[PDB]
Design a protein around this ligand. Structure first.
Ligand SMILES: *[C@@H]1O[C@H](CO)[C@@H](O)[C@H](O)[C@H]1NC(C)=O
Ligand SMILES: *[C@H]1O[C@H](CO)[C@@H](O)[C@H](O)[C@H]1NC(C)=O
Lengths: 274, 190
């Protein structure tokens, strides 16, 4: 069966007033912070990082300070907009290159590094919008070549943040079929009919976990207490976490997000149940 | 001059690998003629040491001090490729046997003193080649020692005698490895 992992991933970047990346990390409430989002990328040199007017000139030192304290940091790409696509293999390698030379281990004169010498610990795929022509499989396999242990590099935690619905959209399914996704956060907190905490998530959870046995699965919850998909901490301890911990490839809990977590200290109670 | 993030190279005709996942403060330093030194404080995971890169089954002559305060390993450590393998010939360890809850297996005699054999699958884990699924073998010692001889030809041939394939050698060092601990270690290979 295999249960508690003590792992809590929290998203960050969706509102400046949620406080810095270093403040998140020093809360001692999260084992991984996923910055959010690289909301533009495609068949051109156009890339954009949206951190919602967040203090950019803090995050680089905070990444390193996070890593020292045992909290790795990844960057999620995509989001809820339609300003991104990856419609070719060449589009995917350009994405890798940009990611790599901007935020990871690469260094090229013609490519700036917003976070200085800080070197990120992973990439997340938040792919609300896409088509079957997308080549996130190409991105994923290249990223996986840089998930390094015992050599000149560091671990890269490759993940996908997906809608509750199984089976996933083609562009997500195509990437996941590479087999080398470390973790998948299933989001159970959206207003999606037939697939959220109020109705459908246990069934979605059953199929997801079975389809990718080599991948860890995080149950994705909202920390906004005013959402109808919010689950009281009591019911997490008693219902959500036990159910999800039935499956062998349970990895932990994902929380959307740091802004709403500061509003209700959801993780305080939740971290003991993860 | 000391380093603090992952890197490889050559130092006085020895291959050196130092890897860390970034956790804590791990400081690596190369000395002369096969020595290296690591001091660490609340690390996450790191490996470190000297050896040979395109490495034969070398007859390893090591010596020094290995003083973990917590969990750490001091093994003749290496990888193969095709198939991918990670092997440990564990000489000593800190506060935790790395074979904690593995189906007990053994054993093999070598260089005076005996060892123990284990095997276990790593699935979608980081490695020298990236995200992979491979076995990690062990040669644990039921008595700890820090210094002596480990003729790697005997450990390799004993695993292959039973049901565990190897592959082409890529690197083999005497690894000091910390896991969520502090400590210090100064090992010298020859
Ligand atoms: C959450 O807890 C922190 C300290 O852990 C405190 O500073 C903050 O005011 C709390 N906020 C809420 C919503 O309880
Ligand atoms: C993608 O296309 C590139 C050319 O840019 C090619 O070299 C590479 O092997 C392809 N990757 C895969 C395996 O789809």
């Amino acid at each position: 069966a295999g249960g508690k992992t003590g792992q809590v991933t929290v998203f960050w970047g969706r509102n400046k007033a949620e406080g810095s990346l270093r403040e998140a990390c020093d809360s001692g409430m999260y084992t991984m912070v996923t910055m959010s989002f690289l909301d533009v990328f495609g068949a051109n040199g156009k890339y954009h990082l949206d951190l919602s007017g967040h203090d950019l000139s803090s995050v680089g030192a905070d990444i390193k300070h996070c890593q020292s304290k045992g909290v790795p940091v990844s960057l999620s790409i995509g989001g809820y907009g339609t300003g991104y696509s990856l419609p070719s293999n060449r589009s995917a390698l350009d994405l890798f290159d940009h990611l790599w030379n901007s935020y990871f281990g690469g260094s090229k004169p013609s490519v700036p590094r917003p976070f200085g010498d800080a070197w990120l610990d992973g990439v997340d795929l938040f792919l609300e919008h896409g088509t079957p022509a997308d080549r996130y499989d190409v991105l994923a396999l290249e990223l996986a070549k840089h998930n390094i242990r015992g050599g000149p590099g560091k671990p890269l935690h490759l993940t996908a943040t997906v809608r509750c619905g199984y089976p996933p959209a083609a562009h997500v399914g195509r990437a996941l079929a590479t087999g080398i996704f470390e973790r998948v956060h299933v989001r159970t907190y959206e207003s999606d009919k037939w697939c959220n905490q109020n109705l459908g998530w246990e069934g979605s959870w059953d199929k997801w976990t079975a389809a990718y046995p080599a991948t860890r699965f995080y149950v994705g919850l909202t920390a906004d207490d005013k959402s109808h998909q919010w689950v009281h901490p009591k019911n997490v301890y008693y219902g959500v976490a036990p159910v999800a911990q039935k499956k062998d490839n349970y990895g932990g809990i994902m929380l959307w997000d740091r802004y709403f977590d500061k509003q209700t200290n959801y993780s305080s109670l939740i971290k003991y149940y993860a | 001059q000391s380093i603090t993030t992952s890197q490889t190279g050559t130092n006085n005709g020895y291959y050196y690998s130092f890897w860390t996942n970034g956790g804590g403060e791990v400081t690596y330093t190369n000395g002369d003629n096969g020595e290296y030194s690591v001091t660490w404080v609340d690390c996450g995971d790191f490996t470190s040491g000297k050896g040979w890169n395109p490495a034969n089954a070398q007859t390893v002559t090591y010596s020094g001090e290995f003083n973990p305060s917590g969990n750490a390993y001091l093994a003749v450590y290496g990888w193969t490729t095709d198939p991918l393998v990670e092997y440990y010939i564990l000489e000593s360890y800190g506060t935790y046997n790395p074979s904690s809850g593995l189906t007990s297996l053994g054993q093999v005699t070598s260089d005076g003193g005996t060892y123990d054999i284990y095997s276990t699958q790593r699935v979608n884990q980081p490695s020298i080649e990236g995200t992979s699924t491979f076995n990690q073998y062990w040669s644990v010692r039921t008595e700890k020692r820090v210094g002596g001889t480990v003729t790697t030809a005997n450990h390799f041939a004993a695993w292959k005698a039973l049901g565990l394939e190897m592959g082409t050698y890529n690197y083999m060092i005497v690894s000091t490895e910390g896991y969520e601990s502090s400590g210090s270690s100064t090992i010298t290979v020859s």
